[PDB]
Subunit: 255 residues, 3 copies
């Protein structure tokens, strides 16, 4: 059973679905879309229950900031959004809680989805990791990215490290993370962190244009291609060729 709109609103999220496209909006603009444990676990539940027809997922924020990262209340011992924090616990179980949070991000790599992050203003820490977890990022010219965790004495543990390294290379990833510095939209484009940067007023139109292009390609070939691309880096060439060819047999049969 998918989370209800009421349940999602209590977790700071909106979800709407129109045919093949789902839009998830981070919806705590008064806290600049700061993230909580409940928000991460509801994201996971959305992923697990999306209709089979959905093949594009767009993640956006309400207001001028994509996400200010982890809600600073998560660093206290009291419950947040009804749920215990890592600090509640510390005052195996912790490992299980973190794993449950990571499930909110992992599903954005599913082969049967194209995930798109549409980022304006800051994407800090967990928020930067959410954007990194998506297949594609479209940034407003107001976007500012930062991996703040190390500044706080923490590591990035919401699945961001792999896509960051893939995008910018290990050397630049070291520089960004170990300085915890802020990257503006122009630098983000230059470093491959954004696939497109547009004026702030055009971000919705640019997302819509991309969605239209994706929907114009048939769903089964889109999914099979994504699945191939995700394997390509780790396979040797001979193996990748065999996987490509195996995928085509199934496409040619359908056609």
């Amino acid at each position: 059973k998918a989370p209800t709109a009421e349940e999602l609103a209590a977790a700071g999220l909106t979800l709407t679905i129109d045919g093949e496209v789902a839009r998830i909006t981070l919806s705590r603009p008064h806290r600049r879309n700061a993230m909580t444990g409940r928000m991460w676990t509801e994201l996971a539940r959305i992923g697990h229950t999306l209709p089979q027809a959905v093949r594009i997922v767009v993640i956006t924020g309400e207001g001028p900031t994509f996400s200010s990262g982890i809600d600073l209340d998560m660093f206290q011992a009291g419950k947040v959004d009804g749920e215990p924090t890592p600090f509640t616990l510390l005052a195996a179980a912790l490992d299980q809680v973190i794993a449950s949070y990571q499930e909110g991000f992992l599903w954005l790599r599913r082969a049967d989805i194209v995930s798109i992050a549409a980022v304006r203003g800051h994407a800090i820490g967990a928020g930067f990791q959410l954007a990194l977890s998506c297949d594609i990022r479209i940034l407003s010219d107001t976007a500012q990215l930062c991996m703040k965790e190390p500044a706080l004495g923490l590591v990035p543990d919401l699945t961001g490290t792999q896509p960051l390294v893939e995008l910018v290379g290990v050397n630049r990833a070291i520089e960004l993370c170990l300085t915890a510095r802020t990257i503006d939209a122009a630098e983000a484009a230059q470093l491959r962190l954004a696939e497109r940067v547009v004026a702030d007023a055009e971000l919705d139109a640019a997302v819509d244009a991309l969605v239209a292009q994706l929907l114009a390609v048939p769903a089964a070939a889109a999914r099979a291609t994504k699945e191939l691309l995700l394997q390509a880096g780790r396979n040797d060439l001979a193996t990748q060729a065999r996987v490509e060819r195996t995928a085509q047999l199934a496409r040619l049969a359908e056609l």
Copy 2:
């Protein structure tokens, strides 16, 4: 026995050899160098029979288009260039036929060759994959690249997925393939898809300049270095260092 010029012309290809350099030209300009099964299998035969002296291979097209991709006659049941199509068959064997086509591209990664694609106008689908299979691409400013297969309900299965991911990263590869969109020469340079972009009238000169630079480096060291570079991504650092050192023992002995 190498394919004869007559046999190659029947398959839409020219091959000339001058000392250490082989030039392969796609030669069906009236069909914008559309590719067939026979063309792919002759490419493989060229690779398998090149003289040992050849260490540079340049791939070009006749006319304004590098290649319009697969010949649309390949989507019919009739034979093409004397050979059955995948659709002839569908109306294991198919898997073997596709594997035989892939051999036309795989050999361009051989350590004892530097392969160069010199691209003007469109390189679509199989043609984009041919260019991707080469070590180096030099583009005219008129070049336009596109991975059309998914738009047609197919996957890229001519060995293009791995080099595309290596060049642009998995995230951008998803965006390019799942939108099937056209990339102009300036964007291609920006995304690392071209090592150099030059004015159309200068493409032959730029290729010649590169060939001259490659020939100025001794053949045995060029081959040994290429072989090291191809392993570097998949090895851990300790292993890569051991492989480097093993390669140098053999070079130092010769010197």
Copy 3:
């Protein structure tokens, strides 16, 4: 026991330590910081004996050239800096000698260090490999990089091949190495070979600014993050997520 300043000066090196930062300066400006076997083995000894407090290492050259690569005396049979050359030997043991040289570069990848190369003028061959071995490169606008080894009939065997491929991709790495061509600072920035390029007179200030940013992030989180980033490329995503989470348990405990 760390090498003494006197011993290091005999090997063409200076080392100074100020709290958490070590500065290693190549110090044979009359030979444009050409490198010898003794210099490589002293670099290794510095790495092995650095105080535990050191977490940033900056590598610079004296004078206008970062390093002219291997000292051409290393291609003779006589001893250099008191030590036998590969050619002394040739006129398993050689394999052990090369491995001992590689130890001078390998340690720059240690998770408990951030290594920074500050490059002006030429970095040729072994010198290019030294810069590549560091986590971060800051280039003067006067910097010129080149992988000369293949021009000399050799391969790069001082651990440079892996970081070069990571930075520029295998295709561009082939082009650079097999032409042995010179890359200026603007192209180096464009190819990700430099994280920042600054005017020559500002290189020391830019290095100091970076050091300040690194020192502002706590040491334990910096080390744990570097260690995660170094694994990210080779792990699958599920594994990388498990490693991230394991690293965070230890950070959260400390906090």
